């Protein structure tokens, strides 16, 4: 029953005119609860989950103020990085940042993180010990030395181990009706004849939460990966997720195949077999 809180930030430079596009989203496990879009009219941090709207004005004023400070830092960074990499000013670039904390099943601090990327590749990241930094290249190296002298890690560690975890627990309690509830996948199987001698069996997993799940096909009690297809887990759009796995089999032998579903909301894994 571990949980986590994470903030994602993306900034895209626009050399033609104006400031970078800035977008920030906040999540608790697989549930988004806040967002900020520089392109939006409010210019304020906004709610994306019912249970977060319980927070008062001081909350939203503080979060708004802070998220704007985040965008300005990203604006400055885009400039600093263009220099480090000796890049033209005519091209658009991207900086991304993600940070957060996890609490174990004991609801105690488990781990924290703070990673950074430039143009889609790792740049610099705080190591699990939350004291050292991992720099991907010499540009990141200069940042590392600067953050080590400024003791940036110590400041982040205090947040990740303290503030971060404290608010995560607060949110978990306020939105317990959903955040602390698991939605077991709703499953069924479909049959589609692809020829006079072959058929496709598709195992469906629907409306489940959290997203983490495992679907596996077995033939006569043995895992089978040959002639199978597994799509990536996808959002239903209503907060839940979907996934399916298919296998091509000889018409008339459908009984040999079983679909196994593992999910946190299932006391024990489910096994499905064609009618």
């Amino acid at each position: 029953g571990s949980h986590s809180m994470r903030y994602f930030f993306t900034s895209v430079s626009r050399p033609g005119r104006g400031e970078p596009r800035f977008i920030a989203v906040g999540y608790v496990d697989d549930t988004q609860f806040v967002r900020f879009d520089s392109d939006a009219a409010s210019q304020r941090m906004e709610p994306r989950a019912p249970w977060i709207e319980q927070e008062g004005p001081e909350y939203w004023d503080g979060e708004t103020r802070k998220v704007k400070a985040h965008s300005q830092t990203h604006r400055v960074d885009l400039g600093t990085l263009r220099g480090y990499y000796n890049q033209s000013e005519a091209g658009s670039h991207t900086v991304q940042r993600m940070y957060g904390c996890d609490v174990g099943s004991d609801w105690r601090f488990l781990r924290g993180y703070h990673q950074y990327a430039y143009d889609g590749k790792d740049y610099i990241a705080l190591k699990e010990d939350l004291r050292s930094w991992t720099a991907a290249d010499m540009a990141a190296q200069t940042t590392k030395h600067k953050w080590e002298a400024a003791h940036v890690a110590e400041q982040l560690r205090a947040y990740l181990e303290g503030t971060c975890v404290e608010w995560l627990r607060r949110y978990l309690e306020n939105g317990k009706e959903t955040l602390q509830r698991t939605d077991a996948p709703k499953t069924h199987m479909t049959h589609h004849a692809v020829s006079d001698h072959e058929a496709t069996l598709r195992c469906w997993a629907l409306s489940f939460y959290p997203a983490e799940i495992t679907l596996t096909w077995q033939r006569d009690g043995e895992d089978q990966t040959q002639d199978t297809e597994l799509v990536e887990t996808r959002p239903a759009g209503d907060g839940t997720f979907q996934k399916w796995a298919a296998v091509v089999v000889p018409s008339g032998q459908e009984q040999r195949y079983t679909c196994h579903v593992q999910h946190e909301g299932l006391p024990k894994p489910l096994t499905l077999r064609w009618e």
Binding site: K66, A69, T73, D77, T80, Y123, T143, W147, A150, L156
Partner: peptide, 9 residues
């Protein structure tokens, strides 16, 4: 809740 200070690269 977001972190308060965000150092520049």
């Amino acid at each position: 809740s977001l972190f308060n200070t965000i150092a520049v690269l």
